[PDB]
Symmetry: none
Subunit: 263 residues, 4 copies
């Protein structure tokens, strides 16, 4: 490889007729491009540019001007390949079920690729460069990622009115003597509309996001087992790169998470 500051400097001094303008185009200095050029000529055993101003290419430097040109033509179309911008994001289920959807209001002008994943899989999607960022419970930066705290999600204990009197008071004896809902005397019932439907059906008691368990408790369809609550910090982790798109989304997500508890 012979690239690449020395080439752009060569094309510059050749296309614009001067060392000054070259500088002007590369945000460098007249003397800084001069020796930038003399290097390149050194390592090819000939003189590429002719000092006389306006300075055009010497015959033996044409191919290198051609190189600079086709190189640059390639780079362009490459950058294109990699219209609507695609952003792939990972989110944990309770977040998609709860606060994350706000983000959709800010994002109708791009093309989302949303994945519902847990801590471990989010991390993989990050590392493997398929997910640009993840809502996750992991606090330690994933390789190549920056970590933004989002606050905490709060979970309550819940069952139905009937499930209470069946398993009196919270007879703290009925620890396992009570049937319990879960995700992955315990029934496993994913989604959200059924993990909810299970509990509503006096089928068990479970940990529900406060925000989800909100309405039914007011309806009276739900009752709190007890006044214990568990608090899980969420984090936005994304690629530690400076990019307008990464920043936009980090910002949208942080704002859709405003109503979470203080971390």
């Amino acid at each position: 490889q012979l690239d690449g500051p020395q080439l752009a400097a060569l094309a510059a001094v050749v296309e614009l007729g001067s060392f000054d303008a070259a500088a002007e185009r590369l945000h460098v200095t007249p003397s800084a491009v001069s020796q930038r050029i003399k290097s390149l000529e050194q390592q090819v055993g000939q003189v590429l540019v002719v000092r006389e101003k306006p300075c055009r290419a010497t015959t033996a430097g044409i191919p290198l001007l051609r190189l600079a040109a086709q190189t640059a033509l390639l780079e362009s179309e490459a950058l294109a390949e990699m219209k609507r911008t695609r952003i792939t994001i990972a989110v944990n289920a309770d977040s998609m079920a709860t606060w994350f959807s706000a983000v959709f209001d800010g994002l109708g002008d791009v093309l989302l690729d949303v994945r519902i994943e847990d801590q471990d899989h989010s991390a993989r999607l990050l590392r493997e460069g398929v997910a640009m960022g993840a809502v996750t419970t992991e606090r330690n930066p994933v390789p190549g990622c920056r970590v933004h705290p989002l606050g905490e999600m709060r979970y309550l204990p819940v069952a139905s009115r009937p499930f209470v009197q069946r398993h009196d008071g919270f007879t703290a004896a009925a620890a396992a003597k009570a049937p319990s809902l879960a995700w992955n005397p315990t029934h496993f019932v994913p989604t959200t509309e059924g993990f909810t439907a299970a509990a509503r059906a006096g089928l068990g008691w479970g940990m529900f996001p406060e925000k989800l368990a909100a309405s039914p408790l007011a309806d009276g369809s739900f009752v709190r087992v007890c006044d214990i609550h568990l608090d899980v910090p969420l984090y936005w982790q994304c690629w530690k790169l400076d990019s307008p798109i990464i920043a936009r989304i980090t910002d949208t997500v942080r704002a859709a998470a405003s109503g979470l508890y203080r971390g």
Copy 2:
């Protein structure tokens, strides 16, 4: 010769991914587990377990995996027809996302006395869990009987192509043309989701590539649509409400009927038949179709 606690060994070694693990799980030495799987590999003439890293079934070990589990259920019932009173049996069933959010919910209400393990899986994922004995039944879009399984029709689920009014204004002011449909953003659960594609085909006898968002889950897919991101196919039970609200509007007059089926272990089982009755009844509200 015809098997035994040899299957037990297999199923344990695969579900637990270790020879040592499944040994301190059935009260026996690695050697025993090894000869047990070996003797079974001998009888059947096939290698059944990849021994490496985490232990998994080979292709040929899938059917005996299932065999082990149908046998385990058959066994615990034959020995409860002898003694129930209490018995809390573990039942695993696969269910497609769209069914769980709509009709399937009802199955819990009429359930007992059994411990439920429900998996949200698409057509392909669920057929695997059936083959592998992991699930003793599944709501699937699959009409063809998977191995070791009876097929029950449940009815058809109708899918309406919908979106919010703002979305229609911005993208379908002039209606659902093939010039408009090539530009309006569509939704989808993921790449394997063909629902939107069958419309468009049905609607334009063709196939139109468009901008398409991928948003999974009921809440996820629902917020996307509610948030005017794009149009998408929704189980009618789920659109019924936003159609009243004004929150959703039908993008066009066409729809999709998708036959559902309840596939479960072909065998005798008071627990199976009972679950089947419940699943079938929970679906009495589908469109009759066929």
Copy 3:
């Protein structure tokens, strides 16, 4: 689990009317099945068979007869799933290109699944239980496999007449000063008809199986570089299970390899 010798013994004493015949069907002994039965009844808290001959099942043993029955019905259809027999085999390229094809004469009555793989991939196919056996250069038994020596394949050095006088005599100085053919001053050219076509085209010199390099040397299209030869032992490795199908194929392959050199 309660299975499974005790059940078959129960069904036996129940279906046939006697302990004798039971024995007769299970290749066991009258007294050996008697206590085989009393165990099973012990661990279910009731009497399953009635001593009186011919002995039928007791009411409380019917379900266990049913169990034995449905169990067995399942096993059958399972065994089926796992018409024409499918046999998947791995072979190294130079073997498929050379001696292995003889095997096809003995095998038109089954359905072959032939994979062309090297030592490492063969081994994986074996371990992962997809290939029943592999022709391979590996001598150490793969996990779960038995090893059959097959003999040695012999490779010669070759180029074209022109390639000689271009790279006098084997001026042992032109070690790298000569262009060479290879697989994975060296051109990489797989298949067999082209790895051959390359050399024929004075494009390089390479190691060819003696059997392949046979004809052209007689044609005069090929010449030997020198009289060095390299010898590679081949091995048939397959599942260490006793099975009629495994034995058939181990035998066919060993015979198709008869004309290899003494190992």
Copy 4:
């Protein structure tokens, strides 16, 4: 900003699967390689390399992988248009199995002065190697231009459905009926081989499941057919001989024409154009088709 020896870093880290390796390969510290890939990840705004176990390109790093290699060839030519005389350039090209056994062979005869690295790959495998800069050209059944690639038609290859006379006697005595074709064993290179399936379709406007052997490679597939295992589709150039021999006979009157294409790096290159001329001329013997 616009890249540089940053690509060099990438391509090295991916082709070698290690940050340390590619460092002791370009004379620089891990850190340098790291910042170099980082600065490039920065400029482009994407993660480009999975750092783990063996280092591989991410999807978004594929195009820069190609970029690195087209640049590397462009560079070594621009600097040989300055100085050749000797130069032995490494060129990698993909070629489908059926082309290598028939017409492509000719390309070596009219070749120089260049070091050849030929890969036998099917349609899909070869398009990958083109995208990834691994191959600077490929004979493929793919008409659509892969990214960074010009497409040249080469002609069409004809495929005859054939078998040995013993095979016909035993299985096709009464000819190539859909009742006979459902029973006679067919061949195939593997599951993705659709050649035999397109016949049968062409022959019976339908699709018939049959016993089918899978035997890859030219010698492998050829011995199978010669050994009466089954019927299969053969490049005519290859059947021409056994049709004379009597060794093969056409199973039926139908055939398949498959358009071939030569896809190569879209750019200027005396080496590319030259290779292209040779490939194109080696194929002058295909059927003109189109």
